[PDB]
């Protein structure tokens, strides 16, 4: 006795009709959902299915360094370049690929901030089975951030706007920095 409604993407040949109580649940995993290009910067305009996302990255974007590991160091090199900057690299593990982004942003004149965050090439259900931990180290001080990996769909400009990430001013950076390099520890774990 319910009313059911076509999946959003059906205009991309999805043939599913579901009560509204349930249309999200599937609309998320609906394999017809098309993704933008995860790579920070409006440079690329590719679009394809989740599954086409990881090949796309390892095809048109080979600047992106990769690593197998559950714990690494993401070493953001030459931290003091003046203006906006972006480090990006990738971390494979648990049969998934996560994408780490350090990002400097001068969005309020004179107050330049770093904003670091992680995101899973996967869905939001998928992200939830995981936690990341970025951590900075300096002389007798440490600053650690935990969260669950953002999702390539959701993206990260809002995360970044809300400051739902790790974030630290340059003065801070300096105390954690190494010959102009900022070493970020990163561990991804399961749950």
């Amino acid at each position: 006795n319910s009313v059911l409604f076509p999946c959003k993407y059906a205009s991309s040949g999805c043939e599913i009709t579901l009560p509204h109580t349930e249309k999200a649940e599937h609309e998320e995993l609906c394999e017809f959902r098309p993704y933008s290009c995860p790579c920070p910067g409006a440079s690329c305009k590719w679009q394809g299915s989740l599954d086409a996302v990881m090949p796309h990255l390892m095809h048109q974007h080979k600047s992106i360094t990769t690593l197998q590991g559950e714990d690494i160091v993401f070493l953001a090199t030459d931290i003091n370049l003046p203006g906006a900057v972006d480090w990006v690299m990738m971390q494979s593990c648990f049969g998934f690929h996560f994408m780490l982004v350090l990002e400097k942003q001068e969005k309020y004149d004179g107050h330049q901030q770093f904003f670091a965050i992680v995101q899973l090439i996967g869905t939001r259900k998928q992200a939830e089975n995981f936690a990341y931990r970025l951590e900075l180290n300096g002389h007798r001080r440490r600053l650690t951030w935990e969260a669950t990996p953002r999702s390539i769909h959701e993206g990260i400009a809002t995360a970044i706007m809300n400051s739902d990430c790790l974030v630290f001013d340059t003065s801070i950076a300096q105390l954690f920095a190494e010959n102009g390099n900022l070493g970020i520890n990163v561990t991804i774990s399961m749950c």
């Binding site: 690593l67 690494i72 070493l75 090199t77 480090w87 990006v88 690299m89």
Partner: peptide
């Protein structure tokens, strides 16, 4: 001790 990825800035 972990692997290190020496990453470069872009714009």
């Amino acid at each position: 001790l972990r692997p290190v990825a020496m990453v470069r800035p872009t714009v």
